[PDB]
């Protein structure tokens, strides 16, 4: 029982993309190759998100 709670504003997409690109530093080649070999599917992709 209260006035509708406005959902929080999410983020600016430009800066979101900037941070996402900046995350590329924390990537290990061998482990990334293993993750690429593992076939991500509708379950595996979204299970741990």
């Amino acid at each position: 029982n209260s006035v509708t709670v406005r959902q929080d504003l999410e983020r600016q997409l430009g800066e979101l993309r900037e941070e996402f690109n900046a995350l590329s530093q924390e990537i290990a080649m061998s482990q990334l190759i293993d993750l690429a070999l593992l076939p991500l599917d509708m379950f595996s992709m979204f299970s741990g998100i």
Binding site: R6, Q7, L9, Q12, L13, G14
Partner: protein, 262 residues
């Protein structure tokens, strides 16, 4: 396309100038043939008769309503008033820069600003803009989308406004459309056609909404003055330098308009 040059090779009358000035300048000069006198002096400097066009505006605010710069080179003598710093900065940002503008229909759609180069430019007799930010579910933040009295006011009976709101959030606008029109304008770059000469106080034009930058381009000049005759003699005598400061428009094409060309 690529333009290849050389860094060792030695490489060894058709333009119009427009002087925009306030009414009080002519009022003080008080000589019905002062424009003809200035034309002859420009001729002495090397400008054929009729190549210089004199335009009179009454005020900065009035001139700011859809400025119409129609020469190959334009020089705007803008007087200074300590209560009009933002108005002068807005006018300088409008004319010294090139804007790609599209129409905005506030009464139907919501709008947002894509990036730092995009703003809302409102012009008319009286612009009273109020804004209300919205969230993902189209509910106002700090305002009620239906009651415009709660909106946040960013202008008040302004002849010219260059409004900049937070990017990436929808807004609902309550700009008075009867006496004002608002457009979504993206700044492309510099308009080299026009130079501004502030005839007055300090150098205060901030033509960048970014708070960290207030660049002073070569086309933003300043002169102290006590006689408009002296101001105009200065402009005529140093016309060569002003033209060297300016450059011809590089804009490919835009809406057609009248021009004063040869």
């Amino acid at each position: 396309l690529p333009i290849t040059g050389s860094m060792d090779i030695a490489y060894a009358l058709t333009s119009t100038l427009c002087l925009y000035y306030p009414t009080e300048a002519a009022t003080e000069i008080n000589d019905n043939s002062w424009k003809d006198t200035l034309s002859q002096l420009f001729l002495t400097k090397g400008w054929p008769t009729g190549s210089v066009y004199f335009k009179e505006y009454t005020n900065i605010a009035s001139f700011s309503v859809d400025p119409q710069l129609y020469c190959d080179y334009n020089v705007v003598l803008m007087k200074y008033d300590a209560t009009l710093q933002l108005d002068m900065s807005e006018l300088a940002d409008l004319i010294l820069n090139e804007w790609l503008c599209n129409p905005m229909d506030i009464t139907l759609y919501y709008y947002q600003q894509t990036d730092e180069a995009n703003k809302w430019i409102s012009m008319g007799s009286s612009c009273t803009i109020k804004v209300c930010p919205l969230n993902t579910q189209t509910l106002g933040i700090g305002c009620l989308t239906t009651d415009a009295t709660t909106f946040e006011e960013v202008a008040t009976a302004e002849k010219l406004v260059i409004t900049d709101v937070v990017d990436g959030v929808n807004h609902k606008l309550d700009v008075t459309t009867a006496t004002c029109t608002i457009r979504n304008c993206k700044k492309l770059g510099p308009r080299e056609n026009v130079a501004v000469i502030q005839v007055g106080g300090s150098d205060i034009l901030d033509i960048t909404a970014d708070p960290t930058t207030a660049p002073q381009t070569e086309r933003m000049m300043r002169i102290n003055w006590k006689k408009w005759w002296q101001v105009f003699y200065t402009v005529v005598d140093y016309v060569d330098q002003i033209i060297q400061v300016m450059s011809k428009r590089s804009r490919s094409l835009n809406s057609a308009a009248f021009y004063y060309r040869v």
